[PDB]
């Protein structure tokens, strides 16, 4: 009869194989399915972002990234206002785990994590990207570019470029000018010459390399 | 005040089995990963496992699978592990120790009992 | 798998004295440490975890430091109570090594 709302309460339950797992983000009326890494330093890690098949597309609408979209097995991302309510009512850490197509493996992590925080409405916000301390992994720091920045699409144009960087980049983030990290770009699968379109994190490969999986992970403060 | 109270010594023959018992009070027994350590005298330690009563999901040390299992009595608010087979260099302290919570890896040992020396010999 | 091997084996000093224990690892354990005080016939207790950070009620002298193989703990000045044994455990991976331990004695 009590509720886990994160996943490092699962880990409080006496679960800690990572597979697919309910929680209740929202209240004990409906939950939502989500991936668990129980395993990656410790555990307790939240998925709000998977890809490695390529299969699912991520050039999806502002309503698709609000409301989540996918499959907990395999490639999904959890919904932007999920997202919300997780960080409006506890304090997160940020990891993201990448790797290319030549067998390697990188990260970085940020300290404090949250979307669009002590926010009265995310929509009227934009559901900013909010980023602080950055460790350093394998990877360089990307999204401290993007700190402050509202969600966009190609639906909605937040970015604070002229054009529509969600469409130039055909995926959607939090846009500046234009990003360092579009996790969300085309399955290019491998090294491509057009330019920062693709599943990118700068700081590591470039802008002209696509990355083989992706997952954006959260854990308790 | 939190406190795991441990069995007290035994002394085995070679192939035997050995259970040893650890009661905790002072905190909820269900809410917290529950290890199991071993320390031979003047030796390096060796953890042997973990269980959690609430779920009873386990996962052991790998050169001791298929020798130990662990168990847990909810209603007494007791720990048990059980080494099946025993052999003579198995002689040592065995402790065990809570998992504390801390907001990310945790997976430290803030509480100990205070040892169950088990000696095996012919 | 993942080794831990303290150094030195056995350590004398006095009173007062700034102090430094080393563990080693074998492979690479990332930022994830603890350290532990064993008194002769004690249950060990714990001091430093994750590498660096300390466990409420442990006095300020205590600090870790280090990162990737090695590691290492420091005392500022010692203290009558400080003399036992001390551990290092390997903390990041789930097989779970310990450290060989260290002797820390009074020197006259």
């Known amino acids: 009869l009590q509720q886990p709302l994160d996943c490092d309460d699962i880990y409080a339950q006496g679960y800690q194989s990572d597979g697919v797992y309910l929680i209740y983000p929202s209240g004990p009326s409906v939950p939502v399915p989500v991936f668990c890494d129980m395993t990656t330093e410790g555990g307790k890690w939240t998925v709000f972002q998977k890809r490695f098949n390529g299969s699912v597309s991520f050039f999806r609408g502002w309503n698709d990234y609000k409301l989540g979209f996918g499959r907990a097995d395999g490639e999904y991302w959890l919904g932007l206002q999920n997202m919300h309510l997780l960080t409006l009512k506890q304090k997160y850490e940020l990891r993201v785990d990448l790797e290319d197509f030549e067998n390697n493996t990188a990260y970085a992590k940020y300290a404090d994590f949250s979307i669009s925080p002590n926010a009265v409405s995310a929509e009227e916000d934009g559901y900013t990207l909010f980023v602080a301390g950055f460790e350093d992994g394998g990877a360089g720091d990307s999204l401290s570019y993007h700190s402050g920045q509202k969600f966009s699409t190609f639906d909605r144009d937040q970015d604070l470029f002229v054009q529509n960087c969600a469409a130039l980049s055909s995926g959607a983030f939090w846009f500046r000018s234009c990003h360092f990290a579009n996790l969300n770009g085309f399955y290019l699968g491998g090294s491509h010459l057009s330019y920062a379109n693709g599943i990118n994190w700068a700081q590591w490969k470039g802008f002209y390399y696509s990355l083989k999986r992706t997952e954006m992970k959260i854990r308790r403060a | 005040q939190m406190q795991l109270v441990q069995s007290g010594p035994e002394v085995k023959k070679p192939g035997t089995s050995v259970k040893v018992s650890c009661k905790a009070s002072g905190f909820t027994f269900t809410s917290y990963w529950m290890h199991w350590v071993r320390q031979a005298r003047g030796q390096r330690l060796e953890w042997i496992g973990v269980?959690?009563?609430?779920?009873?999901?386990?996962k052991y040390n790998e050169k001791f699978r298929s020798r130990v299992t662990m168990t847990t009595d909810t209603s007494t608010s007791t720990a048990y592990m059980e080494l099946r087979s025993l052999r003579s260099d198995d002689t040592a302290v065995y402790y065990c120790?809570?998992?504390?919570?801390?907001?990310?890896?945790?997976?430290?040992?803030?509480?100990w009992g205070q040892g169950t020396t088990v000696t095996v010999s012919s | 798998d993942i080794q831990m091997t303290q150094s030195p084996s056995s350590l004398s000093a006095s009173v007062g004295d700034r102090v430094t224990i080393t563990c080693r690892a074998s492979k690479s354990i990332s930022k994830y440490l603890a350290w532990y005080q064993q008194k002769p016939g004690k249950a060990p207790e714990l001091l430093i975890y994750?590498?660096?950070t300390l466990q409420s009620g442990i006095p300020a002298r205590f600090s870790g430091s280090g990162s990737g193989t090695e590691f290492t703990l420091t005392i500022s000045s010692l203290q009558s109570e400080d003399f036992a044994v001390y551990y290092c455990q390997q903390h990041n991976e789930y097989p779970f090594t310990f450290g060989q331990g260290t002797k820390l004695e009074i020197k006259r």
């Open positions: 994750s590498g660096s």
């Open positions: 120790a809570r998992e504390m919570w801390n907001y990310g890896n945790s997976w430290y040992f803030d509480v």
């Open positions: 269980i959690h009563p609430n779920s009873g999901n386990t």
